[PDB]
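Fig. S4 source data, part A: sequence.
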Amino acid sequence: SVQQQLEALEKSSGGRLGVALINTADNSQILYRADERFAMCSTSKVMAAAAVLKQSESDKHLLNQRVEIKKSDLVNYNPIAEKHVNGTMTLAELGAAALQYSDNTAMNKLIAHLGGPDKVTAFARSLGDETFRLDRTAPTLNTAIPGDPRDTTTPLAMAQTLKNLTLGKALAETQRAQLVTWLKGNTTGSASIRAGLPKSWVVGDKTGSGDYGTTNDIAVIWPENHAPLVLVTYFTQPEQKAERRRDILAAAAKIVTHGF
């Protein structure tokens, strides 16, 4: 069975696997350690970007506003923000970089503009997500230390919230459509969830990778002839310098989507 397949996958992987799939056709779900906390890592960027979109619903000027990119803003990873040192980037462009290239500088600007990590948590709360919690900026929010509650959430919680953001009540139509466009254009997840699904399926996702070989991916999937599916696959390991295993996420995705 699916459950027996996942536990077997987990057992041979050498880590801890968290899975949460919601079939919007009938709201049925497939859960594996879905109520356990995991470090979100860069998948938390979706909540930061969405927080800015919610504000833009009340300020038609926000998204095009500018922020200047200094050389001191560059952190451990910023492939897009680097191309703009001494120049500027609009909040929209920062949202794009943070999500489609997982630019860490871009994420920080968004957090800064919102007023800090605590504000992102409040936004999550306003959405009915009582699990999510952002405590730090990039890149320290990626330490993913076992048992550390900072910057974590559960698979089910993130699945429920990702659903509300992309297919439900969370955002106004234009903003919601913008978030979806950003997710579909992601360039960092070909070896993760996407790798475990039929080539024709349309997918929008946000990956994450941190210490303890933490490998994550949350996505919205549009089959050719069925209602959408929302999937969260989190994976983490016992040793601080373990390698990431994007292939485990692909395997989990194939296991749970069998039949759609």
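Fig. S4 source data, part B ends here. The chain has eight helices and nine strands.
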